[PDB]
Design a protein around this ligand. Sequence first.
Ligand SMILES: CC(C)CCN1C(=O)C([C@@H]2Nc3ccc(OCC(N)=O)cc3S(=O)(=O)N2)C(=O)c2ccccc21
Length: 563
Amino acid sequence: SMSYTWTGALITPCAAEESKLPINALSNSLLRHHNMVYATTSRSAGLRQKKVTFDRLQVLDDHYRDVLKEMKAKASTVKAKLLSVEEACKLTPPHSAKSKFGYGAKDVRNLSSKAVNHIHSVWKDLLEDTVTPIDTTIMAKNEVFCVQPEKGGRKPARLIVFPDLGVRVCEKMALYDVVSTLPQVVMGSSYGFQYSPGQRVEFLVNTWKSKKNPMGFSYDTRCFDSTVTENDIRVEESIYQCCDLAPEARQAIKSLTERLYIGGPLTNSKGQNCGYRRCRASGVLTTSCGNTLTCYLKASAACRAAKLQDCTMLVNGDDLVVICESAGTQEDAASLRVFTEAMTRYSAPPGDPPQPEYDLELITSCSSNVSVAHDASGKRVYYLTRDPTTPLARAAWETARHTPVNSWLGNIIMYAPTLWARMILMTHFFSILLAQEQLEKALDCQIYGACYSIEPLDLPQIIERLHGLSAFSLHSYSPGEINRVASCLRKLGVPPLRVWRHRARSVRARLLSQGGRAATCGKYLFNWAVKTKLKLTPIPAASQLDLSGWFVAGYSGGDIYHS
Ligand SMILES: CC(C)CCN1C(=O)C([C@@H]2Nc3ccc(OCC(N)=O)cc3S(=O)(=O)N2)C(=O)c2ccccc21
């Protein structure tokens, strides 16, 4: 069973692709070593194709079937509803790719006769036909990274595979409720997407402390989407079908599974046949839910095979971390080899070889790790951080280019308590917003794969709600964290933190002069900058903002808009 077969036709871009970091008058203030930042293009698609194309062997034992039975029993308690055409239409992003059948995303959102009637026709076809493969478009992703020597230096572009807009709206009708509600029921506390950043830290810290002698490890599956087999996708559907569903929903789900999710023909941007997929499509509604379930199933069974004691898992898509009871250094090493052997048999072999870790702060999961700082009272506060290299490289790109998704805003929200987000990201971008008088302008960014329109003036309310008032007063960061940030700044040629402190005093003063919500941004987001701090009190506007739906489920690749 080959993950892909290829015709020879190239993966083509839809427009001009930039690989070199764009530079304007503002670039140098953030980053000096411009040659270190690059974007992935279709020119490296061939290299990705070779990496993602392989034979999958699967050997399924009693542990696997045992866990599946338990998952199905939980799934059987879920009652899910079909979305109406209108409800599905409103979940479509305004700038989502247009249909090849004579309408765009804005037509869908406006409930135009042409769009709605076509969607009805696609739905009718799904109910009637459960065999005919549905067309997909294959594209190379344009993503910004910093060069990383020993990784081959530069990573090839990721492959995105997605069906037509009409099909995407139909996916929503059939499965939006399922993928939003089922994962937490089946996986419980192990489902990562139910957690805000602070809630994730809470879960990780509490889990670590619950063990007598804790040991943890992240498990990196090599090219997870390609490891997903027809079996896996059919198993996922069987889980979905355990739900209390309308007969209509059951038919649509069965059809989508057979015709889209299991595999299908690949078409480039020019309309040429590129080949065939027999693995996970990155750009469907069930991608996040399917991957989390599949990873959870394989990992749970692998934990049993390895006889891991008092196991606790945390799963987000392909991203897996396990915390358990240590049996000793040699014993743990042996246990992880058995775990890896089990995962490999299930068709989930490792990329990075898994290693036991006895320091929670050194465990990276969802590209992030738990670190410790101190609040204004001097009390230890745990928070989520990461290596700032990619965030800052993407911030550099967004400084000189308008982008659909503003990664900097998402990074400020999710990493608000961090040294680097506060000192660099907040300072840099609020200065930009002040200069253009664009503080009031709402910006698009993605949280857990879903698109949100967010006003930067709401940041103090957002940060207070998610991270607490402590996020505005954190100090005395860990030596490891300080060292990592320092290494990043040297690498990228970012001005030292002392320069950022000086700049922040100016940014703060400007914001305070503006009045209104801008003054609140100055007071709260930049209280770290001044030597004599203010009191900091709860914001009345914070409880008014609707933050439900932010941390319920993952929707990466699912074409989801929540506003
Ligand atoms: C864990 C989280 C609190 C911190 C890291 N983080 C994240 O993990 C995500 C995120 N997580 C995640 C993990 C795994 C994942 O796998 C999807 C797959 N199909 O394998 C997809 C996602 S996401 O939903 O695309 N986004 C994210 O969107 C994000 C955005 C801004 C800032 C931080 C983010």
